[PDB]
Design a protein around this ligand. Structure first.
Ligand SMILES: *C(=O)CCCC[C@@H]1SC[C@@H]2NC(=O)N[C@@H]21
Ligand SMILES: O=C([O-])CC(=O)C(=O)O
Ligand SMILES: [Mg+2]
Ligand SMILES: [Mn+2]
Lengths: 541, 77
């Protein structure tokens, strides 16, 4: 293990870290530890552990204050630091988060891009991160982002594989599952919601928000569509209705109107998630709080704003003398934020540089988590200086696709198509004329084949026939057309490849990301557990 | 080594990356709508299909080495 550690240190010292400039390792002082005034309170995690998920729902319904979900550990660093936040810093502050802020409804620390990114770039197992954080935070409810039938991947998976992931993740410590479909299709969500209910955890059925409900010129996603979707999601027995504003498109007037209309539609508590990209995130949460939203998603101030969540410390003072307060220890949250400000300086190579709010997001509707990666993807392909060009193409491709809901994995499809169009200098009537000779990206082809489900209003018929030439097109759930994976045969071949008997979490990781998990195991054999190094040593040797 | 733009014989990639595996041998039959080679990005796959009905004469890239945007992958006659 010392040999592997010295091997990694020498490799990074000599050849640099992949994907960043081989800069000098700056001397960092130790991050500031919080000084906390601890109050022993009963949390929602305790209610779930003792009385169950329905009692957590009743406790949320009986809370007059708005509850807070901390997205610092997943979404804040996904939006700002390209998901590169390492378990070392999280474990530096995890106990202080669990004790100093027991008023949090949950902490979003898993799922989304973290599962892919930890394995691929950080060379640490997300299951290991979940275990370490679960040990460090026993009284904090753990929330994960689950992309329905797409799981933590970008493609459809069979239903038994989804159920196995939900079982293993619930056993490992995930308590709240935020389940969403990229195209807001209920059949993609039903099996995941049922599996979460069967595992005794909290199922959050999510409505992805797009467009403007207060704009009469855009009637595709109006208020009646969202109300019907909410009623259908309430029929599935999900515990909490979630509303994902992934690009920060929910205006505060719309936020009041949408939440109030959802409250008289369904009896579920409403969990609102938005990004502060337009700069209106705080006033959107204020509008939803006046409308009676139950839980909102906030981040610590040093990792908030921009494409990330609205600030947890800011939302306290925004609601400080209103009818509803935010349920948080604001003095403990400010002390915890001192740590997060210090460790953010470690991730300077991954800084987006997004210094200003953009109201242009109301036009292109790029999700906050996709803002950095789509720009970095243009840099790798050589059009990174043309980001505003691909942002305009992102608007056009969404219109060509039929004004779809853009969120992972559907936003990746629009991002890949927009990058492919600019790289080849294509335009809208050009793909309609020359698309037969053109070779579209695999994500675009699979999306029009139906791998991501059926969009609202269906695909455009002419564009679909151009994009998929002779491949089979399905009109139903892609999970019905996925072969059931036998976990015994997968465990046998994985043991042969990695040299030891894998766990249930390791078998599931091999099904989610076969090449990525195998590449992670090879680096583990070469460099060992590099997650134990601090971030400047991990990044600069 | 630059693939000519305009004539669909000289096909190429779209994004820089690495060709993983070349399913087709050198200079054999190709049917319209058949995967020949995979191109790559950091997190984006592309199985380039057959532009028409034809056959290769010579192959330009091998297993695993880096490729560029527009670079010559297969010239298929
Ligand atoms: C790999 O480069 C990191 C993840 C890239 C995809 C992520 S997942 C969440 C964001 N949404 C999206 O469509 N792409 C982003
Ligand atoms: O990027 C988004 O808006 C959705 C997201 O976080 C994910 O599913 O990984
Ligand atoms: Mg309440
Ligand atoms: Mn988000």
């Amino acid at each position: 293990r010392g040999t592997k550690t010295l091997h990694y240190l020498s490799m990074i010292t000599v050849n640099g870290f992949p994907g960043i400039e081989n800069t000098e390792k700056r001397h960092f002082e130790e991050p500031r530890q919080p000084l906390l005034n601890l109050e022993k309170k009963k949390t929602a995690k305790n209610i779930l552990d003792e009385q169950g998920a329905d009692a957590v729902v009743d406790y949320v319904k009986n809370t007059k204050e708005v509850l807070l979900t901390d997205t610092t550990l997943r979404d804040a660093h996904q939006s700002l630091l390209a998901t590169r936040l390492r378990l070392q810093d999280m474990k530096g502050i995890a106990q202080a988060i669990d004790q100093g802020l027991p008023e949090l409804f949950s902490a979003e620390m898993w799922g989304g891009a973290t599962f892919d990114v930890a394995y691929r770039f950080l060379n640490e197992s997300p299951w290991y991160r979940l275990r370490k954080l679960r040990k460090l935070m026993p009284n904090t409810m753990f929330q994960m982002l689950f992309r329905g039938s797409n799981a933590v991947g970008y493609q459809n998976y069979p239903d038994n594989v989804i159920e196995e992931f939900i079982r293993v993740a619930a056993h490992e410590g995930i308590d709240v599952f935020r389940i969403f479909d990229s195209l807001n299709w209920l059949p993609q969500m039903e099996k995941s919601i049922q599996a979460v209910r069967d595992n005794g955890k909290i199922a959050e059925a999510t409505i992805c928000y797009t467009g403007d409900i207060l704009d009469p010129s855009r009637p595709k996603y109006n208020i009646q569509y969202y109300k019907d979707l909410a009623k259908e999601l309430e029929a599935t027995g999900a515990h909490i209705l979630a509303v994902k504003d992934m690009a920060g498109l929910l205006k505060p007037q719309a936020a009041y109107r949408l939440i109030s209309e959802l409250k008289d539609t369904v009896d579920l508590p409403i969990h609102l998630h938005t990004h502060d990209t337009s700069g209106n995130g705080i006033i959107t949460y204020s509008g939803a709080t006046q409308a009676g939203v139950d839980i909102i998603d906030v981040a610590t101030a040093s990792l908030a704003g921009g494409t990330s969540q609205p600030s947890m410390q800011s939302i306290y003072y925004a609601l400080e003398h209103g009818p509803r307060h935010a349920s948080i220890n604001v003095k403990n949250a400010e002390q915890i934020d001192h740590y997060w400000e210090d460790v953010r300086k470690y991730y300077a190579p991954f800084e987006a540089g997004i210094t200003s709010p953009q109201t242009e997001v109301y036009m292109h509707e790029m999700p906050g988590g996709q803002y950095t990666n789509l720009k970095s993807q243009a840099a790798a392909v050589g059009l990174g200086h043309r980001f505003d060009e691909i942002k305009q193409m992102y608007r056009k491709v969404n219109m060509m696709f039929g004004d779809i809901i853009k969120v992972t994995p559907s936003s990746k499809v629009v991002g890949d198509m927009a990058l492919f169009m600019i790289q080849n200098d294509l335009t809208e009537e050009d793909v309609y004329a020359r698309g037969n000779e053109l070779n579209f990206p695999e994500s675009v082809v699979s999306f029009f084949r139906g791998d991501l489900g059926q969009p609202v209003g269906g695909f455009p018929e002419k564009l679909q026939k151009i994009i998929v030439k002779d491949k089979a097109v399905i009109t139903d759930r892609p999970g019905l057309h996925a072969e059931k994976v036998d976990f015994e045969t997968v465990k046998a071949d994985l043991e042969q490849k990695i040299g030891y008997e894998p766990g249930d979490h390791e078998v599931i990781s091999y099904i989610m990301y076969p090449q990525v998990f195998l590449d992670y195991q090879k680096m583990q054999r070469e460099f060992g557990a590099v997650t134990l190094l601090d971030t400047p040593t991990f990044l600069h040797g």
